[PDB]
Amino acid sequence: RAYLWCKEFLPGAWRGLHISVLFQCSLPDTTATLGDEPRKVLLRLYGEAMVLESVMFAILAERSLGPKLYGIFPQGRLEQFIPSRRLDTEELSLPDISAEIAEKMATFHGMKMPFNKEPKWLFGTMEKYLKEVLRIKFTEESRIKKLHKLLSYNLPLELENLRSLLESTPSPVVFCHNDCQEGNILLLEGRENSEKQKLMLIDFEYSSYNYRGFDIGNHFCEWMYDYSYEKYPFFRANIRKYPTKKQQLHFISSYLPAFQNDFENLSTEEKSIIKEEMLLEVNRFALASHFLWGLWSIVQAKISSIEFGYMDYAQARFDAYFHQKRKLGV
Amino acid sequence: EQPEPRTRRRAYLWCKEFLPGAWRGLREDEFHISVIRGGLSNMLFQCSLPDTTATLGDEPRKVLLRLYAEAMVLESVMFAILAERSLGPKLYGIFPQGRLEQFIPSRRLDTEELSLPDISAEIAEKMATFHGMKMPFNKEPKWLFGTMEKYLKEVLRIKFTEESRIKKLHKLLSYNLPLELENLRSLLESTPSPVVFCHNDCQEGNILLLEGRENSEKQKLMLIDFEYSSYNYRGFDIGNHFCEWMYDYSYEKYPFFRANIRKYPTKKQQLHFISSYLPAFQNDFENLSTEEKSIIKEEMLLEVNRFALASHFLWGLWSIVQAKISSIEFGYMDYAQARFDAYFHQKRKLGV
Ligand SMILES: OC(c1ccc(Cl)s1)(c1ccc(Cl)s1)[C@H]1CN2CCC1CC2
Ligand SMILES: OC(c1ccc(Cl)s1)(c1ccc(Cl)s1)[C@H]1CN2CCC1CC2
């Protein structure tokens, strides 16, 4: 099946003619490349709505901000295989890494995409997941209990509180990644010694026009979560790992001149004003990351096959939401 | 011509939501929209900012709205890629009901303009550029015979009710189309042709003569409407274009087309076309020997002239199917006969 996708969609030596588990499709080591065709490709089997993700991946491939698109078919797609590794959670805090993510995020934000520019994504998704959460019934007594504790916060009332806080919080609408976590950041092989070009932002499943503060606040929230933990619930949460004001300022001091052209040419006092207001903007939007992903995770506990403690994760996001509300005095 | 109130409201919402700058804060009463192309399939509209409104950034003053089975996914990706490589109109917005694309001030070429040496040479260069494209689609040349077999299977099942359509179908069927498809298959089997990304409908109605550029000898045209595009034999794309010289679709009375076999390009006109196509396609071409260049050229004429037979066959079958399924007024059965008449005339000329 994959043999016929790689044979029919790929040029040169493939048109004549190895697979590993996502799939790593390759040509034999003794086979000589006829031209610029790839020796090793990546196959993505799935399992509007595909029209938008496809056009987006095609555009990012064309603009070199994503992996190349080699083939597109109903069952999935053939993409460029990038020799790399994903970053770990502890590396998000590294100054060079943090500064590069901010630059790669700033670049992604300035991109013009053929999608709805109305920032509906944030609240529309939260309402969609909230409507589902209130009608979910679990069979297991342990899950019924965990849900009962989450529903006890009165989620529709909390959403209206978050709505009022965010409406009185100006944040520009940009093309957001919406999932800027370590698992979506590639550390490029060989390029490890590069100070400012060793990374790549990937996996645009959630990308849309959204409030800038959500992409930044959401990334700040991601410093607290490590999804590599090998024992149940298959994640580790650490509130103390949220960026300090200094680490948050280092991130924005790299984000701002990379996004706003004039920024560098402003006065020291003016630069601090934009920055101080930006810390308020992103820390408020961090609350929407906890809320969005917390609701998402309850819906995921009901529908997903994947081995992950979804209900514990929802509780860890809701704990962080209330902790962050307290920190902000909101 | 103004659209229907429901269309005008939906169009206004798509423009204010997908288009940036002055569009984001436009009132319904400030929205300008007019029909470009009517019908039921692919309605076209020009949408615009009032002339009194200033632009804020680099947003367009006017756009084209195109108002329309996952062939929609591939078609959308194709338009996006071509828009990115500056080979098609810019894509401003994609939604289930349609697209917002760049408005290009121009007119389409007329059939008579295809023969013009400068026009012909430029079409050859843009077609050659189009063929050098790497697209993420199936590279097996299954389009041609797959489409023809698909149309033929449909044609063998067709039962018309109108007496003249019945009589016309009887004549076409009498040629023994399945047997004729096999004769065509074996002829093309012994005709080598490189598999490239083809337009597959490179006719006058899909070529834009760009406004202001009518003095630019080599850069005044643009190929558009890539709905039939796929990986196909290079022979087809060129052969199909040569067949298009014979058909004028602007005829205002039924059958809504004029066919003239004498308008097919002469060896001279074909050689002029392939003489612009070849250095545009390989770039090292001019530096080859006179005997090698003449051999490449003579093999190329034979290849495109044989594939022209598949152009006649494919559109003749498509036309019969359209007579059954389409709602658009066109003399489809007369058009099918016109393509089959040409097909047998081209067979006799090739001595095959
Ligand atoms: O998709 C996740 C999943 C976590 C657990 C799952 Cl089961 S899917 C990640 C994808 C890849 C990772 Cl590595 S973590 C997380 C990343 N963000 C979106 C959804 C999750 C919370 C925030
Ligand atoms: O699309 C057509 C149509 C003709 C009649 C129709 Cl009804 S659609 C053209 C569109 C615009 C033209 Cl100008 S010709 C023709 C161009 N090629 C594809 C189908 C037709 C034959 C070859």
DSSP for A22-78?
A: -EEEE--TTPPPSSS--SEEEEEE----HHHHHHHHHHHHHTTSS--EEEEETTEEE
Question: Given A58, A62, A114, which is nearest B18 (Cβ)?
Answer: A114
Question: CA of B155: how far to CAs of A104, A285, B158, B163, in Å?
Answer: 55, 61, 5, 17
Query: Within chain A, which residue ranges are assigned CATH 3.90.1200.10?
Result: 48-67+82-330
- Report CA(A251)–ligand 2 centroid distance (Å): 56
Query: Within chain B, which residue ranges are assigned CATH 3.30.200.20?
Result: 1-69+90-103
- Residue where the block lists tokens 């039939």: B228
Residue A101: both structure tokens together: 């993510």
Question: CA of A99: how far to CAs of A26, A202, A210, B181, in Å?
Answer: 35, 17, 22, 64
Tell me: is residue B43 an annotated ligand-binding position. Answer: yes
Query: Within chain B, which residue ranges are assigned CATH 3.90.1200.10?
Result: 70-89+104-352
Q: For residue B302, give every residue at least 6 positions away whose Cβ sits within 8 Å of its Cβ, in sequence order, or none.
A: B191
Nearest-by-CA chain A residue for B196: A11
- Residue where the block lists tokens 């307290």: A326
Can you tell me whether residue B175 is helix, strand or coil? coil
Is the CB of B74 less than 8 angstroms away from the CB of A78?
no
Chain B residues touching A55 at Cβ < 8 A: 76-77, 80, 91, 94
Residue B222: both structure tokens together: 């643009």
Q: What is the bridge-based pairing of β-strands A23-26 and A19-20? A: antiparallel
Distance CA B4, CA A116 (A): 23
Q: Which of A40, A14, A8, A46 is nearest to A25 (CA)?
A: A40
User: Domain A48-67+82-330 falls in which CATH fold?
Assistant: Aminoglycoside 3'-phosphotransferase; Chain: A, domain 2 (3.90.1200)
Q: Which of A166, A111, A164, A157 is nearest to A285 (CA)?
A: A166
Taking the Cβ of residue B84 and every Cβ of chain A, the question of whether any pair is shorter than 8 Å is answered with yes
Burial of A81 (0-12, 13-18, 19+ CB in 10 A): buried
Distance CA A307, CA A189 (A): 29
Nearest-by-CA chain A residue for B18: A116
Chain B residues touching A78 at Cβ < 8 A: 136
- The nearest CA of chain A is from the CA of B232 a distance in Å of 13
- Nearest-CA residue for ligand 2 atom 20 is B315
Q: What is the bridge-based pairing of β-strands A76-80 and A40-45? A: antiparallel
Enumerate the H helices of chain A as residue ranges.
Answer: 2-9, 50-62, 95-109, 121-133, 141-151, 155-167, 212-221, 245-259, 268-303, 310-328
Contacts 24+ apart (CB under 8 A), A319-326: A319/A237, A319/A239, A320/A221, A320/A224, A320/A237, A320/A239, A320/A290, A321/A287, A321/A290, A321/A291, A321/A294, A323/A239, A324/A283, A324/A286, A324/A287, A324/A290, A325/A287
User: Domain B1-69+90-103 falls in which CATH fold?
Assistant: Phosphorylase Kinase; domain 1 (3.30.200)
- What number does CATH give the domain A1-47+68-81? 3.30.200.20
How many inter-chain contacts (A to B, CB under 8 Å) are there? 79
C-beta A233 within 6 A of ligand 1: no
Under CATH, to which class is B70-89+104-352 assigned?
alpha beta
Neighbours of B42 (CB within 10 A): 14
Nominal resolution (angstroms):
2.4
Question: Given A9, A15, A114, which is nearest B91 (Cβ)?
Answer: A114
Question: Given A8, A50, A115, which is nearest B140 (Cβ)?
Answer: A8
How was it solved? Answer: X-ray
